[PDB]
Amino acid sequence: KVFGRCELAAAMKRHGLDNYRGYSLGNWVCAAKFESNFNTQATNRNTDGSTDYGILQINSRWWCNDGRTPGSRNLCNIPCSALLSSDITASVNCAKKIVSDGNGMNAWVAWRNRCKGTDVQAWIRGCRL
């Protein structure tokens, strides 16, 4: 599914991600925009053989099982395919675990390099929330 910007903000909010771990909803929307362009079916293979899945490009090295990432963990206890669903529940639930792991949203490289310290509220501007 390709979400609209306000549509994704509303979904993220319904699933409890707004101000989760202190991160305003604009931060989450900005991360999704640059991780996946709001496309739930986004995948990207890493040099190390792991893969990133979904709207927040969650990585199989730690967080999901895809059966093809040797020595990896599955800390969200889900198949990576579940992160590709039109319903973002699995991705939100896993993202909550990820952002609680210690380094906050810096776990998302694209967040650190393209969202952090910017005017992230712009990503929710004009949305009915």
Question: Which of 36, 40, 65, 91 contacts Au ion by CB under 5 A?
Answer: 65
Judged by CB under 5 A, the stretch of 10-18, 30-38, 48-56, 111-119 that binds Au ion is 48-56
Query: Distance between CA 52 and CA 110 in Å, rounded?
Result: 12
The CB-of-80 to Au ion minimum distance in angstroms stands at 7
Cβ atoms of residues 48 and 27 within 8 Å: no
Single residue of 59, 72, 91, 93 touching Au ion by CB under 5 A: 72
Instruction: Say if residues 25 and 124 touch (Cβ distance below 8 Å).
Output: yes
- Phi, psi at 80, each rounded to 5°: -55, -30
Residue 54, interface with Au ion (CB under 5 A)? no
Selected from 14, 19, 48, 68, the binder of Au ion by CB under 5 A is 68
Q: 87: annotated binding-site residue? A: no
Distance from C-alpha of 72 to C-alpha of 64, rounded to nearest angstrom: 9
The catalytic residue positions are 35, 52
